[PDB]
Amino acid sequence: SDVFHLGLTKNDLQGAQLAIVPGDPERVEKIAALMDKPVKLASHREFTSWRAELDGKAVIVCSTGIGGPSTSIAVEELAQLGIRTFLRIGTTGAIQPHINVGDVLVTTASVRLDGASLHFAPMEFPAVADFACTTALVEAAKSIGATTHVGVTASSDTFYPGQERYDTYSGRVVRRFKGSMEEWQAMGVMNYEMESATLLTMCASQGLRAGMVAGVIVNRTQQEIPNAETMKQTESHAVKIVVEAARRLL
Amino acid sequence: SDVFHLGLTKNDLQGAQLAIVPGDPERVEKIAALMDKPVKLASHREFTSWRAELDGKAVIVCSTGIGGPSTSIAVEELAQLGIRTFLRIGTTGAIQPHINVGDVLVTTASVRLDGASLHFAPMEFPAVADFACTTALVEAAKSIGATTHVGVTASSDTFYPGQERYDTYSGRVVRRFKGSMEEWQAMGVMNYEMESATLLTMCASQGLRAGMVAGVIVNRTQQEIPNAETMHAVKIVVEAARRLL
Amino acid sequence: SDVFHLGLTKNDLQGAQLAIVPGDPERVEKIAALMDKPVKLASHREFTSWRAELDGKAVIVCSTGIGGPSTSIAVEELAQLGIRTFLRIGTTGAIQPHINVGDVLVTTASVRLDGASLHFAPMEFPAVADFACTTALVEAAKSIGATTHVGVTASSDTFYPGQERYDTYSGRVVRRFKGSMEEWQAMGVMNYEMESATLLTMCASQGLRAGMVAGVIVNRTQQEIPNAETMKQTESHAVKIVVEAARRLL
Amino acid sequence: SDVFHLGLTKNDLQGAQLAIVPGDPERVEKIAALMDKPVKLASHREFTSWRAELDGKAVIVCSTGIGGPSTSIAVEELAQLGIRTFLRIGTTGAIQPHINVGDVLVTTASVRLDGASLHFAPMEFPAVADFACTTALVEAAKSIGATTHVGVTASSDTFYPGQERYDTYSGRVVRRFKGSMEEWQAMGVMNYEMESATLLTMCASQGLRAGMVAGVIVNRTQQEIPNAETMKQTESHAVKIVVEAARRLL
Amino acid sequence: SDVFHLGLTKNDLQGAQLAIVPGDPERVEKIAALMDKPVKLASHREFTSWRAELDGKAVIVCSTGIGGPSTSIAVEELAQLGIRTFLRIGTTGAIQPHINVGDVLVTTASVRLDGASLHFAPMEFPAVADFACTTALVEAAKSIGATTHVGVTASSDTFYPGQERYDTYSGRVVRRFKGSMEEWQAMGVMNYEMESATLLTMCASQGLRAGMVAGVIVNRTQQEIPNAETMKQTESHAVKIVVEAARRLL
Amino acid sequence: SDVFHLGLTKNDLQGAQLAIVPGDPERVEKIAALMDKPVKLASHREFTSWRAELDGKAVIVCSTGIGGPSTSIAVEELAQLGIRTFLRIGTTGAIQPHINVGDVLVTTASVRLDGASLHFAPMEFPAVADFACTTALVEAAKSIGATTHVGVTASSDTFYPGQERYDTYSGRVVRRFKGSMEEWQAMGVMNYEMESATLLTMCASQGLRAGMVAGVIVNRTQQEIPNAETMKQTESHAVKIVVEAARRLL
Numbered sequence A, C, D, E, F: 001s002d003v004f005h006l007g008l009t010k011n012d013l014q015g016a017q018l019a020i021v022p023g024d025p026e027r028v029e030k031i032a033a034l035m036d037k038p039v040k041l042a043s044h045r046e047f048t049s050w051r052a053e054l055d056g057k058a059v060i061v062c063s064t065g066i067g068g069p070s071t072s073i074a075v076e077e078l079a080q081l082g083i084r085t086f087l088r089i090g091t092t093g094a095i096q097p098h099i100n101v102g103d104v105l106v107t108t109a110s111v112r113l114d115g116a117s118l119h120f121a122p123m124e125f126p127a128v129a130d131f132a133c134t135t136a137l138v139e140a141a142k143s144i145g146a147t148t149h150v151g152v153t154a155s156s157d158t159f160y161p162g163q164e165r166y167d168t169y170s171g172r173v174v175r176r177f178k179g180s181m182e183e184w185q186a187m188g189v190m191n192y193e194m195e196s197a198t199l200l201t202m203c204a205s206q207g208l209r210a211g212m213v214a215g216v217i218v219n220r221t222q223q224e225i226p227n228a229e230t231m232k233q234t235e236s237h238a239v240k241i242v243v244e245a246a247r248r249l250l
Numbered sequence B: 001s002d003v004f005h006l007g008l009t010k011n012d013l014q015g016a017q018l019a020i021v022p023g024d025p026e027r028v029e030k031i032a033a034l035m036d037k038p039v040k041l042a043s044h045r046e047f048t049s050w051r052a053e054l055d056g057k058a059v060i061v062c063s064t065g066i067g068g069p070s071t072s073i074a075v076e077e078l079a080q081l082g083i084r085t086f087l088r089i090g091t092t093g094a095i096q097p098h099i100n101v102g103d104v105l106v107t108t109a110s111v112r113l114d115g116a117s118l119h120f121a122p123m124e125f126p127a128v129a130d131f132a133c134t135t136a137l138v139e140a141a142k143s144i145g146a147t148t149h150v151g152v153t154a155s156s157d158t159f160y161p162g163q164e165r166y167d168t169y170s171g172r173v174v175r176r177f178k179g180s181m182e183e184w185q186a187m188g189v190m191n192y193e194m195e196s197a198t199l200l201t202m203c204a205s206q207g208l209r210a211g212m213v214a215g216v217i218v219n220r221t222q223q224e225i226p227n228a229e230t231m232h233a234v235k236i237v238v239e240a241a242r243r244l245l
């Protein structure tokens, strides 16, 4: 290894310059099944990394974990290697009523409701995804025809207070997030995620490229529990897109 | 009138839902030079408007004037009229050596140095331009085929200090902005302009689509004066407007 | 020419170090009708300036336009030329009931609800009008029997959201300003304008003299926006008052 | 005893609509020694209240002590009594070498480097003295013949680090104030004081007239220290001014 | 001789390195009366410093007065003299219903509603008391047999607005502080005080030892207002605590 | 399941109300291996929970992961179970030269350079550890006889910028974190970790007991770098103190 947290070498890159970065470690493999010569690298703490070929060209897939902090570490060290491109592919809950459950969302920029973004750029700097990577997502959805909309995504640090989830121990929410739910709704914000803003701020301001795709588990306005575990084939429907987006980048 | 500042009416629009927004009152008619049938409707104060048609459909061009505040006035009222699309064209100051004079820059998002944006959405909210608009903009600059680069733009609320200019009467700059342009170098900001941050935040936070495009008459790193006053950005706009039209 | 936006040279001032700054360019020539030997200089963009003389000395009246940015440019640009004293005439709407239509308003300092002011000084540094500029206005407001109000005024970055006008496309006002005029009302703030705080800050922090005067055309609280144009000769009051005040500093 | 901290009532006021409010418990009597019918009232903690009259009308001289918080309670409780006009006399440290030792300073506005001001006004609201109270201070300093400088005075919440003195026992300065002092003088800040901003905003905030004047004690730049022990006649020189301004202000 | 404000020369403390710092100047001595060889040191402004012997070893008692600003100077000017431990005792306002009059409250760390603290360390930096100093406070309070609670205290910069006192001259509380007491109460905050946070912040950031113990004369949720002598009786009950607390730290 | 991320049930607790929560999933085993009846509970995502018994009482060791957001979720879910006591143990970086390699760190309060803590309490609120947990933790270190330090801890959202690390791709960090380590160097902060301020704030706000103990696995400041490869003795030596403290809070 050359690097502390990832535990990988420059030779482990395999010549690759691009990395796909999902949040769940056990879904890194799900991506690797759609690629050639799947080779594992390491799985420590939250971070699980994999090696595979796309069109036979080298590409790495590594797990970020939960939140900016965990994400901030991997994205940095992959770039240490280094990568020039990152792909997010996170699971999310939508806050817009007109959007249905199980839809795929491309994000242009992210609301900095996190604190991890401030480490790379001041609050004024927009958490915006790279145009090349952004285009790729819709262009990958162009082939599939997935439900997709254009809009902004909220990126909170906390699961419960930040997204305004009340069935909790405290049952309390600070003034900042008091009425935050519809605050983003009338703003046109599509969903609540936790990893985007950090990544996007980390990339745009460090001369790096990144895109953002998300699969809806549930609409926060709607009442019915997601149709699990049948609808999970649609989780691959976002997976098949993010994979396809890596072609057209070569 | 319907509104207190523009002086436009519902008839003036002709069901127009797209508006081009430059910064110069004197270049509004200059934009209609590639458009069809110009006719003037109201030219009050900073805002000069010329009704025209593109492909048989109503289009308007209205100057924002200089600054976020004045721009917000245009966009809001134009929208009240019934416009949801806004394409801004102007000139900027480049920060990158690979960018030359004569090259057009397109903005993905704005560094919100301004304060008018805060009236639409808090600092945490990003200042992004519409992807449908952005696609057209990039696919118009290549449709022209001029040297074009895409990235982030810093939108100051002031011309001199906010863009770190020391040639001024004082020659001093606040700490936040003292050496900030150098800080902006590594952040990867292409250009400086003064209207986007308010424009993009007010549109993204109201469910409105807006595009941003600009040419370069000066590079901040470049210590050179532009060739004299005859030496794309406008033709692109109409073409960019054509796509979503 | 020396500058860029105004496109003028110092010689055009003929040794003038005083400038009047309105928003409306068409008013500029109307203002210079109260001074003598008026000479037009240029109308590049908003920034319409004019050459006049009062009491033997040269006087300049240059337009800025709505918004601090516009103000900041001209006021900066007039300085290197260069004016050292700045008096602003404007058109405003008050939030206090006792202020009726046809009132002349003078401000001691301004609420920094803007962002342009922040480029000259932190949010702590007050945007205060210079005493020599303030007293002359008051001394002039009392003479011609004009209705005078002295105090603090709010300076919004935006016209519609900032001054709390809900009758707009969206029909919503952001949290920060949702209930903002409720506060200013009880603070004793006089009137709503857009250019005062910025001008004062850049002058008080750069060692310059700044005056501020405006005319009432509408009341925010009072149900009715008054009949569009009839009586606002009040501008004459507002312009007469600033003219007599301007003569003194010379 | 309506008040909790002052230990007083109107009954001791008595019938006064003006309050002179220095920041030194000891000096209160010496101020009242220039006032007709001087009557001691009470001395509790920071507060030291005397009753007297000037030109036939009642005047209140009560010490606020050191600090905004100490000032703030005094204002609330006096105005409860209540004063509409508050006049503070003080001693300050000059940061401008262009200002000479032994002069008098009249403050139009104060940089709110305190925390108490935030309790009465958002940071955007300026800390400005009323036009009437400020003009008489100007006139009085002329009327007595003291060298007058009028302007803006930085109002810190601490004596050592807030006014940029590395002579702290630790010998360090917080980042927010590191290099702040040389940052203020170029902006035109005349001196350093500690209580005006609190008085200025809340009075401007609460509905009341306020004036500020203070005696110069020492210069930050000038290496000449005030002579012991009666170079503090500068306060007495300024004391001539506070009463004379009060003599016109009622 | 030897510092500016206190006016104390260092031998006058007899090498003492710990100082009890109550806020009431004429209430300072009743604490110092329990220690052997009670000696007045001096009385400048609000500060009445006493020197005493604990275990026959020298200890100091100084007045802070009202507010962080005035408190900051004392602790600071006490620091050059060799004092590195400061134990603050005063009257506070509880906001939790379960805490009733006669109960003394020890504070571990404080909600910094102050301004003075910000001059030593950023808002990110906690206003926390020393562990060894804090154990002792309750370690003595229990010995006395006092009803004592342990937790967090909100520390305002103003008596009234910051503690959301409603019946005031204008009867208004600022937008920032509208309903803050309810926030702190639900957040688990014990009491209200004006001086700890600044004392806590500096000493924690200056590398000093700091303790906070206070007697409740009033609870805020409590519709009541402190009634002598139960309040005043409990003061000695708290004096005995902080005095006994002083012996351990010496 | 009842919760979402952990997938735990209150029966798996078996009436446990206390929890040791290190970030790493792998280590958790060893923490329970020194406890009695080591029972693995569930192992999903980054969150591996275990159930143990010490002193006859039910105890729990669950992994939180890296950074605030995940830490917020785990503590939230665990508290819903519900745990009421949280003993955080992790690795860290020494910023004080005197704090040597192999030293145990006890934290009273933490510097909030994180963003998740803003979601439970405004930045004014201190990220302070509960005294009961602290004392138990401190006295545990006392019982063992291991090098220990008591103090303040910094908590960044991000691993590299927030802790002043240069060797990254760009090699740059935002101005906010410029020489910020030197700030803490002088202010007296002890170490660098990524999780505490969330926990401390979360619990105190919530509010509930929590504790933090940690171990030196690096000193950036001292010339000495830590050895490879399992040299970080403290991690096992520090958990001995926390499991000792775990045995005491019951």
Ligand SMILES: Cc1cn([C@H]2C[C@H](O)[C@@H](CO)O2)c(=O)[nH]c1=O
Pocket: A022, A023, A024, A065, A066, A067, A089, A090, A091, A092, A093, A159, A163, A192, A193, A194, A195, A217
């Ligand atoms: C299910 C869900 C996940 N997330 C976040 C938690 C994880 O960090 C991230 C997984 O990519 O998505 C939310 O923010 N809200 C949600 O409703």
Ligand SMILES: Cc1cn([C@H]2C[C@H](O)[C@@H](CO)O2)c(=O)[nH]c1=O
Pocket: B023, B066, B067, B090, B091, B092, B093, B159, B192, B193, B194, B195, B218
């Ligand atoms: C000359 C110049 C103008 N501008 C903008 C600011 C104004 O909006 C407008 C003035 O011509 O152009 C820049 O942003 N950078 C520059 O270098």
Ligand SMILES: Cc1cn([C@H]2C[C@H](O)[C@@H](CO)O2)c(=O)[nH]c1=O
Pocket: C023, C065, C066, C067, C089, C090, C091, C092, C093, C094, C159, C163, C192, C193, C194, C195, C217, C218
């Ligand atoms: C009429 C009116 C003007 N204004 C501002 C707009 C102008 O730019 C400013 C005068 O320069 O007054 C308000 O803020 N509110 C109003 O009601």
Ligand SMILES: Cc1cn([C@H]2C[C@H](O)[C@@H](CO)O2)c(=O)[nH]c1=O
Pocket: D023, D065, D066, D067, D090, D091, D092, D093, D192, D193, D194, D195, D217, D218
């Ligand atoms: C000597 C001096 C006093 N002061 C003020 C603070 C106090 O209010 C008073 C001295 O106690 O004068 C300053 O602000 N700066 C100074 O240099």
Ligand SMILES: Cc1cn([C@H]2C[C@H](O)[C@@H](CO)O2)c(=O)[nH]c1=O
Pocket: F023, F066, F067, F090, F091, F092, F093, F159, F192, F193, F194, F195, F217, F218
């Ligand atoms: C090496 C190192 C790790 N850590 C922490 C961060 C993570 O929580 C954990 C795993 O690296 O250790 C530090 O805080 N500072 C350091 O220098």
Ligand SMILES: [K+]
Pocket: B046, B065, B066, B067, B070, C046, C064, C065, C066, C067, C070
């Ligand atoms: K303008």
